[PDB]
Amino acid sequence: DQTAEIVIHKRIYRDSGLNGANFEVYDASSLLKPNMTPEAIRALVDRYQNMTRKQALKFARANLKLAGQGNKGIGLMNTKNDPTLGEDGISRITVSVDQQAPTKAYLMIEVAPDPDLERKSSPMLVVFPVTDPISGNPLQTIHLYPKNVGYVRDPYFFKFGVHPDGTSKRLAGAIFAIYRIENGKKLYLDMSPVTDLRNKWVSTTDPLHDDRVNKFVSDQDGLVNTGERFLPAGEYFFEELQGVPGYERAIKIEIPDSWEDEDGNRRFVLIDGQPMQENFGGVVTPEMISSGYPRVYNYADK
Ligand code: NA
Ligand code: NA
Numbered sequence: 001d002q003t004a005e006i007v008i009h010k011r012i013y014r015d016s017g018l019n020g021a022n023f024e025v026y027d028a029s030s031l032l033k034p035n036m037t038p039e040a041i042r043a044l045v046d047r048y049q050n051m052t053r054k055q056a057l058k059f060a061r062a063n064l065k066l067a068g069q070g071n072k073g074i075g076l077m078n079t080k081n082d083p084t085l086g087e088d089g090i091s092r093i094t095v096s097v098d099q100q101a102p103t104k105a106y107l108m109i110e111v112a113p114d115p116d117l118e119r120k121s122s123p124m125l126v127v128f129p130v131t132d133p134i135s136g137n138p139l140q141t142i143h144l145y146p147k148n149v150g151y152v153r154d155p156y157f158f159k160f161g162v163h164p165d166g167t168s169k170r171l172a173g174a175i176f177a178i179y180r181i182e183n184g185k186k187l188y189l190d191m192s193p194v195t196d197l198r199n200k201w202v203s204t205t206d207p208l209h210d211d212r213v214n215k216f217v218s219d220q221d222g223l224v225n226t227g228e229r230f231l232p233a234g235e236y237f238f239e240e241l242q243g244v245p246g247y248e249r250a251i252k253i254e255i256p257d258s259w260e261d262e263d264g265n266r267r268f269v270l271i272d273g274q275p276m277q278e279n280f281g282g283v284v285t286p287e288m289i290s291s292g293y294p295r296v297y298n299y300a301d302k
């Protein structure tokens, strides 16, 4: 009789649309009883939410049937680009609902993605109706935001110049690029938009003048900052493409694969071996700029 749309927006968060995620959707109406309380409903939703995906799949595969018109078939959803909203990570399913009494429900569980990412989605039990606070009315479209976590870090350093008389200063106008090594070849961090919380890398004959290659310029505080750009675990290099006049190099970036070690202690990004202070979210603060560490010293005296 009546139908509703469930829309998954699968995105990547750091503790962003992710294509190729897969979900199975089961008719869960049999988990419901007539004249259930809202409290009983919330208790049943929490029970399924607190199961692992594997646990919920053992229960659903054995006992329930796929249901709903998904893009991969009955009960089958794959995340893709949505031209209608120009956003990635989108999958829509049409399901049979009862907007007047809680008698229809769907259990949605992520399965293996299409052939550095924590897939943290939970089993999601959608019990209709879902009442719109704003309007009173039952919702006709449910938007779900299953959680995926990408691990990224935020390298920066300060460029200082040292005079032969031992005076020193922050250097403005040094131009850097970032490269990594793959099969004995340099790939440079490009200007392409991030997809799946992952960067694009280009081979170039001339990184300084190649518009594809992202450049990072030292500012009036000496700061060379990735800024909005981030990197995942591994080893990278800031390469000086144009030195500051009078102070005319690869600076190694070592990114650990986790914020904390087995004992809870911070694992630092190392800049040419120096531990780099960092906050969650990666913003270089005014206090960090005052500190001006880690510092790379460029010598005037040839
Ligand atoms: Na959970
Ligand atoms: Na950054």
Ligand code: NA
Residues within 6 Å of the ligand: 274, 293, 294, 295, 296
């Ligand atoms: Na330093």
